[PDB]
Amino acid sequence: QVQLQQSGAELARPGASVKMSCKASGYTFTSYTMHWVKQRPGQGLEWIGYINPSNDYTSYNQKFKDKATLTADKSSSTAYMQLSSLTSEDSAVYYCARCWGYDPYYFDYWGQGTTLTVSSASTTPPSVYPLAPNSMVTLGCLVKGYFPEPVTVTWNSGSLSSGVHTFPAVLQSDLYTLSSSVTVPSSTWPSETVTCNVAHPASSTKVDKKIVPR
Amino acid sequence: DIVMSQSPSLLAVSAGEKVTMSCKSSQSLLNSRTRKNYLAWYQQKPGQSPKVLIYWASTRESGVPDRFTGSGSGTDFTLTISSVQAEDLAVYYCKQSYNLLTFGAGTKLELKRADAAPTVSIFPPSSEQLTSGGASVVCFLNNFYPKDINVKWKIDGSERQNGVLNSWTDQDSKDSTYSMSSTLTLTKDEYERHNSYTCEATHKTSTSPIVKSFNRNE
Amino acid sequence: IPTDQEIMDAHKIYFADLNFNPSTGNTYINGMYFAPTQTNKEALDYIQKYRVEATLQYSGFKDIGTKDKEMRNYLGDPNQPKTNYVNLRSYFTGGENIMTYKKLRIYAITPDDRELLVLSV
After folding, report:
1. The domain spanning residue A193 has which CATH number?
2. Residue range(s) defining the domain that contains residue A161
3. How far does the CA of residue C60 sit from the closest CA of chain A (Å)?
4. Out of A106, A140, A172, whose CB is closest to B40?
5. Which residues of B touch C58 (CB under 8 A)?
6. Of B12, B84, B170, C5, which sits 20 to 30 A from A173 (CA to CA)?
7. Does domain B119-215 fall into CATH 1.20.1250.20?
8. What's the number of domains chain A is made of?
9. Which long-range contacts (CB under 8 A, 24 or more apart) does C107-113 make?
């Protein structure tokens, strides 16, 4: 059973360096080439380069010639990728993939992916802002200025599940911001309380924000 | 660099339909010594690693359903799903390995449904955010289809582009619609220099944009 | 120190480590034994690395690498002494099968970087 086990998620400051690993098992590590693929959030796949563990031969996408450094340890059957001079452009998911064929023909086995986030920010708890404004009324919740991902948003401790849209977070000014909307009948609000529950386990923070009529 | 062009970028399909997507190369991927086209197709579902479907342009990988079929030679290639299924909803990347390796931009499959206008709601900056010095005006555009839509911000009639951030949901698993959040963030002083803040949504379901507004003074 | 003729003559008797399927007819090479004789112990022990060029199923005739030799019981017989064994499983094939009865070349690497074609099929 072929398995590719990658390193855990990584955070790094700009201009620094990181080294990820791809633990290989279930096959002869030296008889297949190990490739690395980049995927920025919301974008497509991008080939970085490959290493031949048998002879340590490397081939790179010229975009990553100065950025990436591929190595391989035969004794441990582990492939490494070193990224240097990290910028915001490097924040992406990086896959290691085993390639079949003497010449590269296809990727038959992939790693689960290593998430890289480049930011000058350290762990920052979120600020939770209420969004108060027909038979239906839409309320909101603005979770702003936190780092790192993720935060989770529920409404009335899960009692409100339908009519909820929680939007993906955006990274701007080195901090994350997301919003969540909930739609309830106008007979329920403001007659009954609607509360926004925000959790940020990275900072061990739970915030409950009651949506009060403006 | 060998350039990979995939079309269409987005494809709305119905269950059971025949679905075809193309991948074109800037140079021939056919190796004359082995007479094989060094092109492969990969499927990626959200939150999962890519999985190979076809290699050598037309060789189906063991374990891939028979509904997937790749064809083409040289510079024009095609991936065909004889009967698209709900599990077939994903992004499909073509990849060359003739000279180095290059992925295509991908072709996304979405569930086709009837067009739906967005439910637009606008929100003033909260009092708690204003004590921090910032001011974010939030616009929700919920449950619309198709995904393509233009939203513009106008302060006191004048359009505003900078300081606007957008966020889309994936296609809703219940009703196959999309939702968007648009947030115009300004400084508290800038927010206090103007009165009217509006959010304008242009969607193919109507010729006239959907307008939601509020006046800071009221 | 053995001369080039002694090294080549020490690799004149060889056996292929094969796995054969009588039902499908397919054959796979695992490695190659170089037989120990009464007058070849010095030349065999003098060689430590082996370069192999093999015929891959889809990529064709390619150099599969230059690896250190292994010391295995000749023909897998425990009663037989250990001898030079070219283990093809440690060379680079991209997972491709080595065609058993197609072109194959094996070179012996001397410690002073001479390469001598010792097997040709």
Report:
1. 2.60.40.10
2. 127-211
3. 9
4. A106
5. 34, 36
6. B170
7. no
8. 2
9. C107/C50, C107/C51, C107/C52, C107/C53, C108/C7, C108/C8, C108/C11, C108/C47, C108/C49, C108/C50, C109/C47, C109/C48, C109/C49, C109/C50, C109/C51, C109/C66, C110/C7, C110/C46, C110/C47, C111/C46, C111/C48
